[PDB]
Amino acid sequence: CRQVNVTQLDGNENLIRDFLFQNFKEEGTVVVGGYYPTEVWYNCTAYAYFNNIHAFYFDGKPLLFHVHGEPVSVIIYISRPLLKHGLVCITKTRNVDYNSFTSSQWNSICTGNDRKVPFSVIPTDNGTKIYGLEWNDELVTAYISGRSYNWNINNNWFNNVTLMYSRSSTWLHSAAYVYQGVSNFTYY
Ligand SMILES: *[C@@H]1O[C@H](CO)[C@@H](O[C@@H]2O[C@H](CO)[C@@H](O)[C@H](O)[C@H]2NC(C)=O)[C@H](O)[C@H]1NC(C)=O
Ligand SMILES: *[C@@H]1O[C@H](CO)[C@@H](O)[C@H](O)[C@H]1NC(C)=O
Ligand SMILES: *[C@@H]1O[C@H](CO)[C@@H](O)[C@H](O)[C@H]1NC(C)=O
Ligand SMILES: *[C@@H]1O[C@H](CO)[C@@H](O)[C@H](O)[C@H]1NC(C)=O
Ligand SMILES: *[C@@H]1O[C@H](CO)[C@@H](O)[C@H](O)[C@H]1NC(C)=O
To answer: Are 170 and 102 within 8 A, CB to CB?
Structure first.
């Protein structure tokens, strides 16, 4: 909705250079290519829609976004075990109510046959590292802090995500999240 230089924020000066040098641990020069985030990000019961994207990056304020796929879809909800802000819901179902998901209690949200995984957003890096997701029809990569985790799942991803940025009060009404979707093969 509104563009923002992501490197001009506080604590986000080196959140990108710390990401392009994750795997390059040698001395010298090299040109790399991939779905790498750019400098201009997007700070903006509200919804946002990204289409034709291959990766999704972003940087206790709550956020929610749903990655569409068949026959399994992914829900990431950052808001209950102690110091476990984030939740991953591997929904095998189709359309899901994004309001009843957040308004209801955390004890019964991702229930039924849907897999629930509570993960700890590290509240000690002061939001100075990129959080991200990347997917193809064979592998799903998650970037949290400075490490990459892989999952092997055979899915049919639709390359679009649904994002919730505004709602009424596990949800505190605030806007402290920047996000971006990557669709082109960028070189650094
Ligand atoms: C994400 O993309 C998928 C795949 O294109 C969309 O699913 C199709 O949506 C169209 C309308 O745009 C329907 O006519 C098709 O029947 C849908 N196909 C399937 C297999 O579901 C989906 O709507 C997109 N979602 C968002 C939120 O943009
Ligand atoms: C980013 O900063 C440059 C100057 O460094 C400015 O011209 C540009 O408009 C900014 N882009 C934004 C705010 O989207
Ligand atoms: C995060 O901020 C705290 C509070 O100022 C500081 O003690 C800590 O070292 C910071 N962590 C970093 C810079 O990795
Ligand atoms: C995004 O912009 C809004 C509206 O101007 C502002 O309140 C908010 O602080 C910005 N968010 C960040 C993380 O900079
Ligand atoms: C991706 O690059 C093409 C040219 O290769 C350009 O036309 C298109 O607008 C780019 N897409 C985005 C989302 O920036």
So the answer is: yes
d(CA 137, CA 126): 33
Compute the half-sphere exposure of residue 166: CA atoms within 13 Å on the CB side of its CA: 7
**Cβ(39) to ligand 3 under 6 A?**
no
Our answer on whether the CB atom of 61 is closer than 6 Å to any ligand 4 atom is: no
DSSP sequence for 24-64 = --SSS----EES---SEEE-----EEEES-SEEEE----EE
Residue nearest ligand 1's atom 9 by CA? 158
The residues, any chain, with a CB within 8 Å of residue 45's CB and separated by 6 or more, are 98, 99, 164, 166, 167, 168
Whether 178 and 39 have beta carbons less than 8 Å apart is answered as no
Task: Decide: 9 in ligand 4 pocket, CB within 6 A.
Answer: yes
Report which residue type is found at 111: T
Annotated resolution, angstroms: 2.7
